[PDB]
C-alpha cells in the first residue's frame with residue numbers, strides 16, 4: 001500500500017504524559033480498553049480490515065494465547081527482523097514503510113506502542129493523526145511511572161469533538177469518564 005495516512009493511538013496521564021511503569025500500564029480503565037478495541041477494529045469499506053503496528057517488546061508483553069490481536073492485521077517491528085509475511089494476520093518488518101509495502105485491502109493504520117515506537121514514529125511524516133486519551137487524577141505524582149511521551153505538541157492542533165466523532169464514525173464517545181480516581185476524555189490532534 002503506498003503512503004497511507006497513519007494514526008498513533010495512546011492513553012496518557014496528564015500533566016507529564018506518563019504511559020507506563022516497569023513494562024505495564026499504571027492503570028486499568030475498562031471502558032478505555034473497549035474504546036481502543038472498537039476504534040482499531042471497525043471499518044467502513046467492505047472486504048477491508050485495519051492494521052495495528054507495535055514494537056517487539058509490546059508484542060512480547062501480550063500473553064501468547066492472546067496474540068495476534070483479533071480482527072486486525074498485526075505488524076511487529078524489530079531492527080532484527082526481515083520483511084516477511086508470517087500468516088494472513090502477522091507481518092514482521094524492520095521499518096514502518098517497508099511493512100506497508102506488504103499490505104493490501106487495509107483501511108486505516110494505527111501505531112499502538114510502546115514508548116520507543118511512539119517517540120521515534122511521531123517524527124515520521126506518514127503520521128497524520130493522534131488519538132490521545134487524556135487521563136486526569138487528583139494526585140498524579142502518587143502514580144509511579146518511568147515512561148513518558150516526548151511529543152512535539154506545539155506542532156499539532158487539538159480538534160473539536162465533532163472532528164473526533166467523524167473520525168470514529170459510530171463509536172459512542174462519552175465525556176469525562178470516571179473509573180476509580182481517574183477521569184478521562186478522548187481527543188484527536190492533526191498537524192499544523
Ligand SMILES: NC(=O)C1=CN([C@@H]2O[C@H](COP(=O)(O)OP(=O)(O)OC[C@H]3O[C@@H](n4cnc5c(N)ncnc54)[C@H](OP(=O)(O)O)[C@@H]3O)[C@@H](O)[C@H]2O)C=CC1
Pocket residue numbers: 009010011012018019020021022023024025054055056057058059077078079080094095112113114115116117118120121147
Ligand atoms: N499508555 C499506553 O497507551 C501504552 C503504553 N505502552 C507502554 O510502553 C512501554 C513499553 O515500551 P518499550 O519498552 O519502549 O517497547 P516497544 O513496544 O516500544 O518495543 C521497543 C522495541 O521495538 C523495536 N523498535 C523500536 N523502535 C524501532 C524502530 N524505530 N524501528 C524498528 N524497530 C523498532 C526494537 O525491537 P528490537 O529491539 O528487537 O530491535 C525495540 O527494542 C510499557 O510501559 C507499556 O505499558 C505500550 C502501549 C500503549
Ligand SMILES: Cc1ccc(Sc2cccc3nc(N)nc(N)c23)cc1
Pocket residue numbers: 009010011032033036058059061062111112113133
Ligand atoms: C501488552 C499491550 C499493551 C498495550 C497495548 S495497546 C493499548 C492497550 C490497552 C489500551 C490502550 N488504549 C489506547 N488508547 N491506546 C493503546 N495503544 C492501548 C497492547 C498490548
